[PDB]
Design a protein around this motif. Structure first.
Motif, PDB file in Angstrom:
ATOM      1  N   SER A   1       0.819  -1.207   0.000  1.00  0.00           N
ATOM      2  CA  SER A   1       0.000   0.000   0.000  1.00  0.00           C
ATOM      3  C   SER A   1       0.855   1.260   0.000  1.00  0.00           C
ATOM      4  O   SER A   1       0.503   2.254  -0.643  1.00  0.00           O
ATOM      5  CB  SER A   1      -0.940  -0.008   1.205  1.00  0.00           C
ATOM      6  N   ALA A   2       1.972   1.250   0.733  1.00  0.00           N
ATOM      7  CA  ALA A   2       2.834   2.427   0.768  1.00  0.00           C
ATOM      8  C   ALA A   2       3.396   2.741  -0.613  1.00  0.00           C
ATOM      9  O   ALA A   2       3.388   3.900  -1.048  1.00  0.00           O
ATOM     10  CB  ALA A   2       3.964   2.219   1.774  1.00  0.00           C
ATOM     11  N   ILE A   3       3.872   1.718  -1.324  1.00  0.00           N
ATOM     12  CA  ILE A   3       4.417   1.940  -2.657  1.00  0.00           C
ATOM     13  C   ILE A   3       3.318   2.363  -3.622  1.00  0.00           C
ATOM     14  O   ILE A   3       3.538   3.204  -4.501  1.00  0.00           O
ATOM     15  CB  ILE A   3       5.156   0.684  -3.150  1.00  0.00           C
ATOM     16  N   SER A   4       2.118   1.793  -3.479  1.00  0.00           N
ATOM     17  CA  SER A   4       1.008   2.214  -4.330  1.00  0.00           C
ATOM     18  C   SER A   4       0.661   3.681  -4.096  1.00  0.00           C
ATOM     19  O   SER A   4       0.403   4.430  -5.047  1.00  0.00           O
ATOM     20  CB  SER A   4      -0.210   1.327  -4.080  1.00  0.00           C
ATOM     21  N   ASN A   5       0.653   4.108  -2.831  1.00  0.00           N
ATOM     22  CA  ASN A   5       0.377   5.505  -2.518  1.00  0.00           C
ATOM     23  C   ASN A   5       1.461   6.416  -3.075  1.00  0.00           C
ATOM     24  O   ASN A   5       1.169   7.514  -3.563  1.00  0.00           O
ATOM     25  CB  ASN A   5       0.249   5.685  -1.006  1.00  0.00           C
ATOM     26  N   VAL A   6       2.720   5.981  -3.005  1.00  0.00           N
ATOM     27  CA  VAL A   6       3.805   6.767  -3.585  1.00  0.00           C
ATOM     28  C   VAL A   6       3.628   6.884  -5.095  1.00  0.00           C
ATOM     29  O   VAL A   6       3.850   7.951  -5.680  1.00  0.00           O
ATOM     30  CB  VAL A   6       5.168   6.153  -3.216  1.00  0.00           C
ATOM     31  N   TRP A   9       0.865   9.437  -5.706  1.00  0.00           N
ATOM     32  CA  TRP A   9       1.320  10.798  -5.447  1.00  0.00           C
ATOM     33  C   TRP A   9       2.261  11.285  -6.539  1.00  0.00           C
ATOM     34  O   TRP A   9       2.198  12.451  -6.944  1.00  0.00           O
ATOM     35  CB  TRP A   9       2.001  10.881  -4.084  1.00  0.00           C
TER      36      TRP A   9
ATOM     37  N   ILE B  32       8.214   2.770   6.589  1.00  0.00           N
ATOM     38  CA  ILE B  32       7.892   2.701   5.165  1.00  0.00           C
ATOM     39  C   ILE B  32       6.419   3.021   4.934  1.00  0.00           C
ATOM     40  O   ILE B  32       6.063   3.761   4.005  1.00  0.00           O
ATOM     41  CB  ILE B  32       8.269   1.320   4.599  1.00  0.00           C
ATOM     42  N   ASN B  33       5.541   2.468   5.772  1.00  0.00           N
ATOM     43  CA  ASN B  33       4.111   2.725   5.627  1.00  0.00           C
ATOM     44  C   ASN B  33       3.789   4.198   5.841  1.00  0.00           C
ATOM     45  O   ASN B  33       2.959   4.767   5.126  1.00  0.00           O
ATOM     46  CB  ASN B  33       3.319   1.854   6.601  1.00  0.00           C
ATOM     47  N   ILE B  35       5.865   6.705   5.326  1.00  0.00           N
ATOM     48  CA  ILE B  35       6.386   7.404   4.155  1.00  0.00           C
ATOM     49  C   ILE B  35       5.394   7.311   3.004  1.00  0.00           C
ATOM     50  O   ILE B  35       5.147   8.292   2.293  1.00  0.00           O
ATOM     51  CB  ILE B  35       7.762   6.837   3.763  1.00  0.00           C
ATOM     52  N   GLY B  36       4.813   6.129   2.802  1.00  0.00           N
ATOM     53  CA  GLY B  36       3.802   5.987   1.769  1.00  0.00           C
ATOM     54  C   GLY B  36       2.546   6.792   2.055  1.00  0.00           C
ATOM     55  O   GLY B  36       1.956   7.381   1.147  1.00  0.00           O
ATOM     56  N   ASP B  37       2.126   6.833   3.322  1.00  0.00           N
ATOM     57  CA  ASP B  37       0.849   7.451   3.663  1.00  0.00           C
ATOM     58  C   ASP B  37       0.923   8.972   3.614  1.00  0.00           C
ATOM     59  O   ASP B  37      -0.029   9.626   3.171  1.00  0.00           O
ATOM     60  CB  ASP B  37       0.394   6.982   5.043  1.00  0.00           C
ATOM     61  N   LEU B  39       2.478  10.993   1.736  1.00  0.00           N
ATOM     62  CA  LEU B  39       2.407  11.556   0.395  1.00  0.00           C
ATOM     63  C   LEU B  39       0.976  11.682  -0.110  1.00  0.00           C
ATOM     64  O   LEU B  39       0.710  12.521  -0.976  1.00  0.00           O
ATOM     65  CB  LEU B  39       3.236  10.706  -0.567  1.00  0.00           C
ATOM     66  N   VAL B  40       0.046  10.881   0.409  1.00  0.00           N
ATOM     67  CA  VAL B  40      -1.356  10.973   0.023  1.00  0.00           C
ATOM     68  C   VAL B  40      -2.218  11.585   1.111  1.00  0.00           C
ATOM     69  O   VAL B  40      -3.421  11.786   0.892  1.00  0.00           O
ATOM     70  CB  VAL B  40      -1.919   9.602  -0.394  1.00  0.00           C
TER      71      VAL B  40
END
Lengths: 49, 48
Positions: A1-6, A9, B32-33, B35-37, B39-40
């Motif tokens: 999910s983190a990579i998908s959100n990146v 963005w 990591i989570n 960092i991903g979150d 950005l959105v």
């Protein structure tokens, strides 16, 4: 999910990037065109435009 | 053999047996989570 959100963005940032560049080009060209054109002398004031 | 090569003699063991291994892995995964979150959106308390 983190990579998908990146990914999402980054795609949004690229969309904003291209839209802003296109808007800048369009605004500058519009201003240049408006400056180039504009008021012209009427028929009675002089023969040429 | 246990002093020199502990591979064959000792069988597979759970990560939780290692001191702090699960904690470090959880911290890295949460970083990591986050960092991903961020950005959105979804404002979250930063780890570090």
């Amino acid at each position: 999910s983190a990579i998908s959100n990146v990914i999402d963005w980054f795609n949004s940032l690229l969309n904003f990037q291209d839209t802003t560049t296109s808007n800048q080009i369009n605004q500058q060209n519009f201003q240049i065109a408006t400056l180039a054109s504009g008021i012209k002398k009427q028929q009675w004031e002089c023969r040429y435009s | 053999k246990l002093l020199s090569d502990p591979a064959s003699v000792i069988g597979p063991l759970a990560q939780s047996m290692i001191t702090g291994l699960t904690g470090a892995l959880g911290n890295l995964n949460t970083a990591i989570n986050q960092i991903g979150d961020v950005l959105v959106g979804t404002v979250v308390t930063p780890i570090n």
